[model samples]
Target: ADDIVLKAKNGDAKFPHKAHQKAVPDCKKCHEKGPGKIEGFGKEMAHGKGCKGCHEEMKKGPTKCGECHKK
Candidate 1:
C-alpha cells in the first residue's frame, strides 16, 4: 500500500501503487510469480518491459523518461 520510488542519477521514478491497482486489477500481470515482491525487478526492467514498455503497449501511463523519471 506504499509507493515504490526508485532512485537514479537521471531522476527518481515514482511507482504509483494505488493507481496501478485501479488500472491493472490483475496482480499477476506485473507480479508474474506471485503477489508479494517482484523476483528480479530493477532499473533495467523498469526502463524496459516491466515499466515503460507496459505504458507504451497499453497506451497509458508515462513512457517518456522525463515523464516518469522526474527531477
Candidate 2:
C-alpha cells in the first residue's frame, strides 16, 4: 500500500509506517508497549508525545518534522 498520507492545515504529509516499522520495533515501539496504546491517541497525539519518547530514550533518531516530511 501507498504510504499513509495525512492532511494538515498547512498541507499533506505522508507517514511511512512500514518504513518506521523496519527501523523501530513493532509492538514494543509503537503497539502494545508504545505510543499506539494511549487512550485518546491519534496521529497527532501519538507522533507528538510518543515519538519523542523513544527519541529521548535513545538519544538519537530524527525528531524534526522535515526529517519525515517530503519537500
Candidate 3:
C-alpha cells in the first residue's frame, strides 16, 4: 500500500507522488530526470499532466480520498 500526498500553493492543486505511482506504470514516466525539475513541461504539468490529461479525457482517474490524501 502506498500513500499519495499533495500540497496546495495559493489554492492551486499540487502533484501527489503516490497517486502518480499508482496511475503510471513507472516512475520514469514523469520523474525520468530525477527528484527535481521535470524537463519539457512545467512543475505542476509534469505531475498533474499525466493524471489530469488521462482523467479528463478517459474519466478513469483516481479521485478517492486516499488517492491524494493519506491518513
Candidate 4:
C-alpha cells in the first residue's frame, strides 16, 4: 500500500504488502503467479469466492465496488 499506486480505468488501487502479509502468512493466497499479483482480487475464483470472501471472514471488509477501488 505504500506509495505503489495501481491506476485503473475508473479508480486506483494499491496492495498493502505489509498488512496482507500480516493477515495471510501464505503467499499463495495472492501469488498464484508466484511472486506477483493476487490470486483472486477482482478476477476469476476457483471457490466462487476469493478475496471478498476472506475479507468477510477476517475483516468483513468492503464488498462494494467503490469501497475497494477508492473512487
Which candidate has the top score in TM-score?
1
Name the better of 1 and 4 by lDDT: 1
Model 4: per-residue Cα lDDT over 1-71, one tens digit each: 25465565567755466877777887776566644345334444411255457776666556666765775
Query: lDDT by residue for model 3 over 24-71, one digit each (tens)?
Result: 676675555655553445445624654555566546765443443333
Computed on alpha carbons, the lDDT of every model, listed in order, comes to 0.81, 0.60, 0.51, 0.58
**Once superposed on the true structure, which residue ranges of model 1 sit more than 4 Å away at CA?**
32-39
In the predicted model 1, the residue pairs found to clash are: none
In order of appearance, the predictions have TM-scores of: 0.80, 0.49, 0.38, 0.51
Q: Which digits, one per residue and each the tens of the lDDT, describe model 1 over residues 1-71?
A: 57878887788888889889899887887665655456577777887888988888888999877899887
Best prediction by lDDT = 1
* lDDT measured at residue 40 in model 3 versus the true structure, 0 to 100: 43
| Ten-residue stretch with the least lDDT total in model 3 | 4-13
State the local distance difference test value for candidate 3: 0.51
Ranking by lDDT: 1, 2, 4, 3
All candidates in order of TM-score, best leading: 1, 4, 2, 3
> What's the residue-level lDDT of 16 in candidate 4?
61
Which one wins by TM-score: 2 or 3? 2
